[PDB]
Amino acid sequence: NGPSRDVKLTFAQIAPPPGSMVLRGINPNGSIEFGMRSDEVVTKAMLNLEYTPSPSLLPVQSQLKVYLNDELMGVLPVTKEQLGKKTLAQMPINPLFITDFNRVRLEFVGHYQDVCENPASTTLWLDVGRSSGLDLTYQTLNVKNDLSHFPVPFFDPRDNRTNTLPMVFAGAPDVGLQQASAIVASWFGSRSGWRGQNFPVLYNQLPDRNAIVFATNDKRPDFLRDHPAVKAPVIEMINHPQNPYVKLLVVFGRDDKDLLQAAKGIAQGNILFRGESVVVNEVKPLLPRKPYDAPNWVRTDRPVTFGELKTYEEQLQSSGLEPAAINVSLNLPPDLYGIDMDINYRYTMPPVKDSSRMDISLNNQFLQSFNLSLDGKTDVSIPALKLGATNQLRFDFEYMNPMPGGSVDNCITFQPVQNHVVIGDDSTIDFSKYYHFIPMPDLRAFANAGFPFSRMADLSQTITVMPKAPNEAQMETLLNTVGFIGAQTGFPAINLTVTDDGSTIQGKDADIMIIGGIPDKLKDDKQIDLLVQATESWVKTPMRQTPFPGIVPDESDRAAETRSTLTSSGAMAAVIGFQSPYNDQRSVIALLADSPRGYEMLNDAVNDSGKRATMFGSVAVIRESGINSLRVGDVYYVG
Amino acid sequence: NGPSRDVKLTFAQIAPPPGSMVLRGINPNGSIEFGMRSDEVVTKAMLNLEYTPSPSLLPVQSQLKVYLNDELMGVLPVTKEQLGKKTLAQMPINPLFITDFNRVRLEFVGHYQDVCENPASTTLWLDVGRSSGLDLTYQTLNVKNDLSHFPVPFFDPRDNRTNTLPMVFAGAPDVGLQQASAIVASWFGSRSGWRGQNFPVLYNQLPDRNAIVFATNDKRPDFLRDHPAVKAPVIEMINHPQNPYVKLLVVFGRDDKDLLQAAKGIAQGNILFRGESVVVNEVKPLLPRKPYDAPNWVRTDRPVTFGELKTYEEQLQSSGLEPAAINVSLNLPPDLYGIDMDINYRYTMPPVKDSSRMDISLNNQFLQSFNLSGKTDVSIPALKLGATNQLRFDFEYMNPMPGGSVDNCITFQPVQNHVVIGDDSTIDFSKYYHFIPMPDLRAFANAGFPFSRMADLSQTITVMPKAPNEAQMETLLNTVGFIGAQTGFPAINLTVTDDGSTIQGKDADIMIIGGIPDKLKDDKQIDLLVQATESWVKTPMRQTPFPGIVPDESDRAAETRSTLTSSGAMAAVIGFQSPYNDQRSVIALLADSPRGYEMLNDAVNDSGKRATMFGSVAVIRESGINSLRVGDVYYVG
């Protein structure tokens, strides 16, 4: 029937890093997780395991149980011919139990000795190699062209891949149509938060996959020549003419003033979709946005609770023979510039007085410890440990269990009772004792949060200087830029102001984002440290670039030492930040690219969250090698 | 398929000294690191182990597991016939898990008895002998001629070997080409800091490996005679004409003024390298360098924090039952003349008060101690802060798990400890002056001091011979090579001359690679000369193996002068005072015979042999290097 695809999920990318799970006696549970699109269905599932049993295991009393959503699929005993040898097992997974979200948990029942056995012994282990994994074949369904569940054919929250969503136009879209696209692109990036975005743009084509079609009565694409011209901006869902499984979202209006109204109904609030086609009429303007009010950012205006920082409910509690580390990810403004926590926790009482303790770590670095000596409460002061756009607060509850005691003639073993620890809610963390001050130009803040343009979530104080006639590469790097910017804040850029020429930005109190080339009125301002012409290029390398700079900027190290000008026929992109000459507090970020291949490297380095995190300083050269970034130029402060 | 090569990485050289790791119950892990170049791939890998388990281990419950990049490669149970006897194991490492940087880790699972087993006991041990090793087989790849990753085919940071990089010339270079090559040589040294440098010079001859070719429209090697003449400095990565797996970097120009421009393009603007050819255009300088501004030396103007002394993010913290020592490297100007430390450290506080403490060391010498029962303000004595130094924070714990009594005994699983020498902990060197008693070859060998005072060698004049042969050009590139490795900055403004009559009235340190200009040969500060076969040296009045701080000018006075005439080989590095400026120095790297240059370049390359130079002269023979603190003393600063 439909088109099916075979995927090979390996334990390297779907299991906790590094991928190899060492099943032990204290933590006998390993688990991988995968989700199924509601427009797909699995037909064959097979779990290829590669485990190495401990040479000390009792053979047929030690097993490796494999569950799927707490439903035992099969058990693999440890036959005596496997002890210490890399065993290659393969268990079939029944697709009838594969729901929209699935958990494959491996339990390891391990025994090394009948009598006087220490269950927490380091001799009980079973190392599942990272080469293990699932091979799944998904089959595409034919969902009816309904909008009640609107984004799920185009962005499925179950699919954890990078949400590729091509946007096809009739031609080079004018400024009115660039605002509508960037608003929808910023919204689809708002939803597909941590998994990445990719908006390949097409002009008068069809992308063979679920896409968006921006069309108007005057300029409409090829296949929409026979569509009736609408009165009000309409949102309708059709299917690819040559593929009854590829759906298309057609944003159709009378002119770009309507597509901007439809794109605001999609992004701002909801249209309350019901049916195949829906006309958008109610604009319902939105109350202005206060700075640093992005939904994905921790509230600095007040002490914020831990119940507000946790995504799901089971995050602030763990249990087992060795309780897992409670994790609380808090995403902060890069403008932030100590912390006062009030943590009330509860835990099972350890055996004796001073054995166990609770270690707090922020960003994988020790902060403080507390003996567990039951409820607890503590006030903690965190130093400013280079707090970035995303931090990780971790609580451990490291217990000390007794080894088998007594004596040789009579050994009393302690059947290990499991410990429940819970970082109790009502626990607050306070950031109100922090000032908003940042030394710009900083690309580690643009890469990680899009800071100059994300301090106002809706990108209201932001101007985008597009090229005059945008090709399918300049329009792509725009939807990708406001794509990830929308993902860091978690709010669409409804109030974005796109322009087309350099004059319209003069004397404005807004941050500028230059997507194409660079306007000649901004081009020769000496705060620029790199320019990418057709083939000729020049860069100012700093005086002294240290691997780790420290909090203080040290303006003396950031001074431009030389100016080199090389001319190569290779490909290069760039992301440079400097100060706007029209305001001493506004910043400007330029996304340069010389050749058609240059944009391909630029858009890639923007989509990939891993490749983007390698950006810092004021200049980030993007070549085939990777990203080489520089801290050079005058460090103007903002805030 | 490209050429293959075999390697034998014994534990003696790749594991921490002394080479043999004694795995225990408290410290059960032991790691060895090896890297893989980008132009190579590992085809075969094997781990030959020679270990000795403790006679008291339980046979199968005690194991030795081998990880590669945290992927279990195998487990070796300690069979009964191995307890206390040296065994020989062999584990085939899977070459599919080998990446640019690899960590092979040996984890020791130890068990000597069932009940009341003290896991911190000193009977749980497994000595892994230092004759163990990895035997790898690398396979060279045909990489694309992409200048984007410029040094990678010529210098690969994943290769911890000496960066041997031939330099092909068309013949005896002119002083413009000698200076142009010395900038590329010093830049490649800037990149391969501790690995070592070596620039074998070739005159109109193919190099057999990745090399740099300097050619001009007029002077060019034979294999470039068909190359069309260029109109601007061109840098292109071409293939060896008879070896597709050997990449040549051809720096081509119209004359030595162009090669001198491309050399500064490589050294400064190498971040704009693209494609298979780059045309350098107008490298423009905007700022000169302050003295002691070398990027490898610590900032002596401001109090530098520990975040700026890091080399990787996780360097200033440790974890484990016996947490490893936290090291911090301090590269200082070699002429400093105590230190105010402010330390912020966090640690898992021991359960009840005990004798657990943190030991601060410096150059493996105890400095202070602090009981873990925070923040501290330490004051460090002088203790002869040399060129490179090594702070260390030990965090020695005492772990008193309860025992009970002999009838009802109990032991507990020992928890691990976390220690963090947090950054924001500063160390101030502004409480110092720049004063040094010279001549001092221990400052030249360890920091290239007189010339490395200005990182870009602005105030430095190299006096080379007229038409230097391949062995004297190799000494210039090797000398400016390690000097650039010390500072971490290329010798951009080095000026090379072939006439000794252009230094009269010059405020710059002088470096003499060939013979010695007669305007200086008759000085009274010269304590040693090596002529064709006759050599004389002045010996001091008293030289004890530990001088102290003061120079002891009455001990350093030349007592005699002996003149010998042998037919053997000898090199010499002599330093003295510039006869034109009382604050400038002169270093003369002298050699008489073709074999003398081989020993000279060998002593300049090997940082082990360079660390054994001191005093005012260093006589290099087949024995080694014998230094002498002899002659007058002038103070610089």
UniProtKB/TrEMBL annotation, chain A:
It is found in: Cell inner membrane. The keyword Signal applies. GO terms for biological process: cellulose biosynthetic process; UDP-alpha-D-glucose metabolic process. The keyword Cell inner membrane applies. Keywords: c-di-GMP, Cell inner membrane, Cell membrane, Cellulose biosynthesis, Membrane, Signal, Transmembrane, Transmembrane helix. One of its GO terms (cellular component) is plasma membrane. This is Cyclic di-GMP-binding protein. It comes from Escherichia coli. Tightly associated with the cellulose synthase catalytic subunit. Its main location: membrane. It is a single-pass type I membrane protein. Belongs to the AcsB/BcsB family. Binds the cellulose synthase activator, bis-(3'-5') cyclic diguanylic acid (c-di-GMP). The chain holds residues 67 to 728 of 779 of the full protein. It comes from the Bacteria. Pathway: Glycan metabolism; bacterial cellulose biosynthesis.
Automatic annotation (TrEMBL), chain B:
GO terms for biological process: cellulose biosynthetic process; UDP-alpha-D-glucose metabolic process. GO terms for cellular component: plasma membrane. It is found in: Cell inner membrane. Pathway: Glycan metabolism; bacterial cellulose biosynthesis. Its main location: membrane. It comes from the Bacteria. It is a single-pass type I membrane protein. Keywords: c-di-GMP, Cell inner membrane, Cell membrane, Cellulose biosynthesis, Membrane, Signal, Transmembrane, Transmembrane helix. Tightly associated with the cellulose synthase catalytic subunit. Belongs to the AcsB/BcsB family. Binds the cellulose synthase activator, bis-(3'-5') cyclic diguanylic acid (c-di-GMP). This is Cyclic di-GMP-binding protein. It comes from Escherichia coli. The gene is bcsB. The chain holds residues 67 to 728 of 779 of the full protein.
